[PDB]
Design goal:
GO molecular function (chain B): rRNA binding; structural constituent of ribosome
Function (chain B): This protein binds to the 23S rRNA, and is important in its secondary structure. It is located near the subunit interface in the base of the L7/L12 stalk, and near the tRNA binding site of the peptidyltransferase center.
Organism (chain B): Mycolicibacterium smegmatis (strain ATCC 700084 / mc(2)155)
Number of domains of chain C: 1
Keywords (chain B): Ribonucleoprotein, Ribosomal protein, RNA-binding, rRNA-binding
Number of helices of chain C: 4
Largest sheet of chain D: none
Radius of gyration of chain C: 17 Å
Structural class of chain D: mainly alpha
Shape of chain C: globular
Largest interface: C-D, 10 and 18 residues
Strand order of the largest sheet of chain C: 5-2-1-6
Chains: A mainly beta (214), B alpha+beta (165), C alpha/beta (146), D mainly alpha (60)
Number of helices of chain D: 4
Distance between the termini of chain C: 31 Å
InterPro entries (chain B): Ribosomal_uL6-like, Ribosomal_uL6-like_a/b-dom_sf, Ribosomal_uL6_a/b-dom, Ribosomal_uL6_bac-type, Ribosomal_uL6_CS
Shape of chain D: globular
Oligomer: part of a larger assembly
RNA sequence: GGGGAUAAGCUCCGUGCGUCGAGAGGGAAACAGCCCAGAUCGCCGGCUAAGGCCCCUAAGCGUGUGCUAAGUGGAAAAGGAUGUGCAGUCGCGAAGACAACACUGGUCAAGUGA
RNA sequence: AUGGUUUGGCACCUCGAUGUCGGCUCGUCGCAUCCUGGGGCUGGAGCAGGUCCCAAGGGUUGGGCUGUUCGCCCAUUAAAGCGGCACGCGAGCUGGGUUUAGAACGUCGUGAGACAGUUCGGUCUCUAUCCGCCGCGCGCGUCAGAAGCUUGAGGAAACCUGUC
RNA sequence: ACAGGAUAACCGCUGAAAGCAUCUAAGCGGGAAACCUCUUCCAAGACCAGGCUUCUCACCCUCUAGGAGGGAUAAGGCCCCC
């Protein structure tokens, strides 16, 4: 069904295809993932597979997480995540301890990458919501960037929950869809994905098969 | 009301099973199952028929009593020898044929048109211009006949398309 | 003076009501009366002296007229244009319990004591309940003829 | 009303029967009897039932 | 009753007419002017008025005979409409009625029309 | 017959203060739908329309003249919708118009002066207490104290279209 | 976006009341950028405060032994530091 893997965003570079066109590609370290736990309807109510990624020294894990990993039967890993499947026949091909690597994907496949967007801090409406600021001249007094009108004239006399104003921005989980995998470097376990994936370099990303184009 | 007071004859060669209001009938052409309305009871007449008895005389019962009778009549005449619907085309360049259990039409569109045959019906095509569909239920046969009629919009000018006999 | 319940006076009993072919208003009114404790001679509006009520066969409730496809259960999120409306039919086919829950809840006081009384009502769409350990007493909706 | 309905009788019919029977106990002591002495309330319900007419809906 | 467009929650007059003003209590969800009723104080007594008795909410998922399918009840007009109950007429009709197969003939089989 | 979107009428509302038009910024709602979507009849041959139903998810341009709303015009576009919310929005902005004090023209008055006639110029104050809204924490709760991974009742976002 | 469900105008099949007829009062179907799912995100303070697991899984003193209070701890967390 829908395959998936945990990886790390390494950076972005440039490649040329067989038509000599340029292809801006993001490098993803789709390293080895180990299945740690299997979610089943009969036990958890839903079907999903749990993957572990990253390497950490054994003295950095707390006792509960170390105990969970030992009960699973594998060495602890830095990151743990779940892949929600659709049914038991989908989860029948995963068993605890099985190692997932990058070559599950093929050249030309369409993938969905999920990551945490970059942080932008306390951002104003001009940046957060694309508001058009007021005039920078012609007598405008200290309103060059303020949003302007909020509500109107009494009536509800309130502000209509969901009003777009300034606040914290970024640092939210974001999924980019229908990204084409240009090349699967099996020996480095590296995926060359055409396009831009969310997050900073060295961040955790989840590469899943596309839900629309797959 | 008037039609329902006459019990419908039941052939001896076809089994009629009555379970309260749920009725199942096994004929030579197959089997069909019908449910009767709750204000009306039904009973297999011992002289080779069934009894359409209406105990109330209010608008609802007087309305559905004849309807139930004619539904029973249609069900028995469909389990005995079924139904057959005949179709044909008017015009030129239109060709109709049977591809196994599925119907393929070339009405003149740039793409081929396929018709899916549901259960209980079959397609008889003795000529490209004219063809037939047969089944044991009148409602299903009529619905499929209308669907097959619908592949062309009505033509009040040349009358090109399909029309009933 | 008039009798007033003390700390240890209140006692509760468990009633299970079958909702198969029952008018929703009638069942809801009976359940609200049972929950309120109006049927006990020691009733006091101050105290929650009601009884735990279990409702099974919630999906089998009876709705007269055409209210199945013309009565709406409204709810507003608060956002602009956040009004959502569902007829009793889809509400029953999706969340069978919620219809009876709303019907019963609408019939008891909207006070804080009503919120506390809501804690004593359990409804189930199936024909069986997990509260067999309490040995509920079957309850039949009867009318005292006058 | 709760105590009377526990004895299969409505409050209004019970009051009418009590008035017909001549018992002059007010509602305060009636409620006190219902809460504290159910047997006395049952006896009063019985005498009220006895005092009631045969057909309550008759034009009498 | 006048003025205004007999429109105004408009204005001006008449009334051994009322209420509020200067008036609490109950009802009309809230609600000076509508309905019941004029508070000397206390009571953990009773009977009632207007209004009500499925739950919120005190007291009737009251009894008997019918109507309503529209949630009418729980907003409104000209006008339109094979909804239905009751009653009253008339047309035609077992010499076979209507339908079905303008007016006429045959099968059929009680009601059929305004 | 609806509506209070137009001018009205009354004056119940505030003269121990309720900013008066346009524009900018930001909205939300109705459908009596401008395009896209689904159909009917065509006095519809096809194209394209005419007209009438269903449909409010999205979209609905940039300029010249005028303070303008309105309007006319220039290019386009799938289309350049109609309205409600103090004819939304000045403790958000502007002061071009109107609506003080200066001055002039025409007209009226003997005169001081005046003109829902015209023209030039002419201070837009405030450190957010409460509700409201956008974000972020502290405390407690979820019947021992913790830690990983999550199900989701419920809610929000998005929904356009052209040519070949 | 694709796909599915129920639908609006509409197109229908099967036929009564009303011996015929009638997309209709019983029924069964098709039918839209609208509706419910479907895509993305938030979400158990969802007081019905959820679920699957894993870890510690114990040591005193006091008033009076009914409960309470105090102390020291385990898993773990925070503060100080980079």
């Amino acid at each position: 069904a829908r395959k998936g893997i945990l990886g790390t965003k390494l950076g972005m570079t440039q490649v040329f295809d067989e038509n000599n066109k340029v292809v801006p590609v993001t490098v993803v370290k789709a390293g080895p993932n180990v299945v740690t736990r299997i979610r089943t309807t009969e036990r958890d109510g839903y079907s999903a597979v749990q993957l572990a990624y990253g390497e950490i020294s054994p003295r950095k894990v707390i006792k509960p997480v170390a105990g969970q990993f030992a009960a699973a039967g594998v060495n602890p890993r830095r990151h743990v995540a779940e892949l929600r499947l659709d049914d038991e026949a989908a989860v029948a091909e995963y068993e605890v301890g099985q190692e997932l690597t990058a070559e599950i994907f093929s050249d030309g496949a369409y993938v969905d990458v999920t990551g945490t967007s970059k942080g932008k801090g306390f951002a104003g409406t001009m940046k957060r919501h694309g508001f058009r600021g007021q005039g920078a001249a012609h007598g405008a007094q200290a309103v060059h960037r303020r949003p302007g009108s909020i509500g109107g004239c009494a009536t509800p006399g309130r502000v209509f929950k969901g009003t777009r104003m300034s606040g914290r921005m970024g640092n939210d989980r974001v999924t980019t869809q229908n990204l084409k995998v240009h090349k699967v470097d099996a020996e480095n376990g590296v995926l060359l994905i055409k396009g831009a994936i969310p997050g900073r370099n060295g961040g955790l990303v989840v590469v899943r098969s596309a839900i629309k184009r797959g | 009301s008037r039609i329902g007071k006459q019990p419908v004859p039941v052939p001896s060669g076809v089994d009629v099973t009555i379970n309260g209001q749920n009725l199942s009938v096994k004929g030579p052409k197959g089997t069909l199952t019908l449910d009767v309305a709750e204000p009306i009871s039904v009973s297999r007449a011992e002289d080779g028929a069934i009894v359409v008895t209406r105990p109330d005389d209010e608008r609802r019962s007087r309305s559905l009593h004849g309807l139930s009778r004619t539904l029973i009549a249609n069900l028995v005449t469909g389990v005995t020898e079924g139904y057959t619907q005949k179709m044909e085309i008017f015009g030129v360049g239109y060709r109709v044929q049977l591809k196994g259990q599925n119907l393929e039409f070339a009405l003149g569109y740039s793409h081929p048109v396929l018709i899916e045959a549901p259960e209980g019906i079959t397609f008889a095509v003795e000529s490209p211009t004219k063809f037939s569909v047969s089944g044991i239920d009148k409602q299903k046969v009529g619905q499929i006949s209308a669907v097959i009629r619908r592949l062309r919009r009505p033509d009040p000018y040349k009358g090109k398309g399909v029309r009933y006999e | 003076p008039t009798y007033t319940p003390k700390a240890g006076d209140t006692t509760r009993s468990w009633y299970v009501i079958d909702a198969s072919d029952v008018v929703l208003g009638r069942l809801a009114s009976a359940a609200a009366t049972l929950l309120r404790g109006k049927h006990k001679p020691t009733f006091t509006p101050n105290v929650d002296g009601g009884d735990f009520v279990i409702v099974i066969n919630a999906d089998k409730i009876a709705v007269s007229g055409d209210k199945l496809t013309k009565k709406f259960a409204y709810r507003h999120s608060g956002y602009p244009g956040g009004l959502r409306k569902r007829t009793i039919g889809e509400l029953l086919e999706k969340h069978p319990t919620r219809v009876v829950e709303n019907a019963i809840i609408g019939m008891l006081p909207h006070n804080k004591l009503g919120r506390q009384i809501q804690k004593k009502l359990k409804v189930y769409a199936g024909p069986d309940h997990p509260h067999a350990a309490q040995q509920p007493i079957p309850f039949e909706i009867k009318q005292v003829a006058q | 009303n709760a105590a009377a309905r526990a004895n299969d009788i409505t409050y209004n019919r019970l009051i009418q029967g009590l008035k017909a029977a001549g018992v002059e106990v007010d509602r305060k002591n009636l409620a006190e009897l219902a809460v504290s002495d159910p047997a006395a309330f049952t006896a009063l319900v019985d005498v009220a039932r006895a005092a009631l007419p045969e057909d309550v809906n008759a034009p009498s």
